[PDB]
Design a protein around this ligand. Structure first.
Ligand SMILES: CN(C)C(=O)[C@H]([NH3+])CCc1ccccc1
Ligand SMILES: [Ca+2]
Ligand code: NA
Ligand SMILES: [Zn+2]
Length: 369
């Protein structure tokens, strides 16, 4: 299918937004990612863009005016005046008020929407925004470290020129905000693989399939702890191939949350960077306009490895396992390699379990026209 044009979205300020002491979400991992892929020489093979700050108008294509007005006004110095609005909008604990919160939203969002525009104009084959993928944000509520749903906004942009858009979520968490936004439409099919059971957000049961015109257009693959490259790989390609066959999207959004990697601080999966990136390779074979977004990921050396390698995959560019020198080199010890090993943790996802869920999903996919 050829090497593809890749446009990549990054703002150097992004790494300076700070969720607070102890908060596992570290925007600095996006800067670590950028610096690593600069030092691999990958800027030579792609267009690097500094995205615009998305305006309140752009955000209110999905989010309510009142919620965006709040995000735009709330600061640590006036939180006291806003205690009621904070509880209503779920801001102040998991989704804290931090300095520059709204600008972080604007730059995260701006990358995804700019990427979608560039794909619409057929000026690129792929667009990458590792500051995006904030799948949990709802119309009028922050959730799961997410305030603005850049994904829903980017998909709404895509829907101006694309009758059918496919969203695929390989973050360990269910892509609930994206699913919810598009639950009653057949113009977006949402496909999420995630741990399910005693795990945030609590949604993404197999039996959640959409409603109304969107019935059979939400697909959820619930999983247990310890899924490995082989088990994930044996279901991701068959499922996505059947989705592509049945749904025939003209554009794809892939959320590449790296908390599905082995050794993630918050995750419980056992994928390597190659196992994760194989999803990008599979989606790439269909030769559809593709927006690649970030997501979760909490062992930040592994996040930078993962998204560097997946930029290389987008570019069809082999990179050495020997990490180049970079501003964060010491974070990659003791090995200073790109690729990671899986752990000895038990795969609770039996081969029969994975095949059974697959077959149920296949029954649901038959129900498309
Ligand atoms: C624990 N938790 C909710 C997660 O891991 C989500 N998948 C992360 C979503 C996200 C991505 C980027 C910035 C903010 C929030
Ligand atoms: Ca997911
Ligand atoms: Na849908
Ligand atoms: Zn996650």
């Amino acid at each position: 299918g050829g090497k593809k044009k890749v446009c990549y979205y990054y703002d150097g300020d992004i790494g300076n937004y700070y969720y607070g002491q102890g908060h596992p979400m570290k925007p600095h991992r996006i800067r670590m990612t950028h610096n690593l892929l600069l030092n691999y020489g990958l800027y030579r093979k792609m267009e690097i863009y500094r995205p615009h700050k998305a305006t309140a108008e752009e955000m209110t294509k999905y989010h309510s005016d009142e919620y965006i007005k709040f995000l735009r006004s709330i600061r640590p110095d006036n939180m006291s005046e806003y205690s009621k609005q904070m509880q209503r909008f779920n801001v102040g604990e998991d989704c804290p008020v931090f300095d520059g919160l709204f600008e972080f939203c604007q730059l995260s969002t701006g990358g995804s929407v700019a990427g979608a525009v560039k794909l619409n104009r057929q000026q690129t084959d792929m667009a990458v925004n590792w500051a995006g993928g904030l799948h949990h944000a709802k119309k009028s509520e922050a959730s799961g470290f997410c305030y603005v749903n850049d994904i829903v906004l980017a998909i709404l942009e895509l829907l101006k020129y694309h009758q059918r858009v496919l969203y695929i979520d390989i973050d360990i968490h269910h892509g609930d905000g994206v699913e919810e936004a598009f639950y009653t439409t057949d113009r977006v099919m949402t496909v999420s693989f995630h741990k399910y059971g005693e795990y945030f957000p609590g949604t993404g049961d197999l039996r959640d399939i959409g409603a109304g015109k969107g019935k059979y257009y939400a697909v959820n693959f619930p999983m247990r702890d310890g899924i490995d490259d082989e088990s994930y790989g044996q279901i991701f390609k068959p499922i996505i191939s059947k989705v592509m066959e049945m749904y025939q999207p003209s554009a794809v959004v892939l959320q590449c949350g790296a908390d599905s990697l082995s050794g993630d601080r918050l995750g419980c999966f056992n994928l390597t960077v190659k196992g994760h990136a194989k999803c990008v390779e599979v989606v790439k074979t269909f030769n559809l306009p593709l927006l690649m977004l970030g997501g979760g990921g909490y062992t930040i050396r592994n996040v930078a490895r993962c998204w560097t390698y997946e930029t290389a995959v987008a570019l069809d560019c082999e990179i050495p396992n020997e990490l180049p020198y970079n501003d964060y080199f010491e974070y990659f010890g003791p090995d200073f390699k790109l690729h990671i090993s899986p752990s000895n943790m038990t795969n609770q996802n039996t081969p029969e379990y994975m095949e059974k869920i697959k077959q149920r999903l296949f029954e649901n996919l038959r129900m498309l026209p």
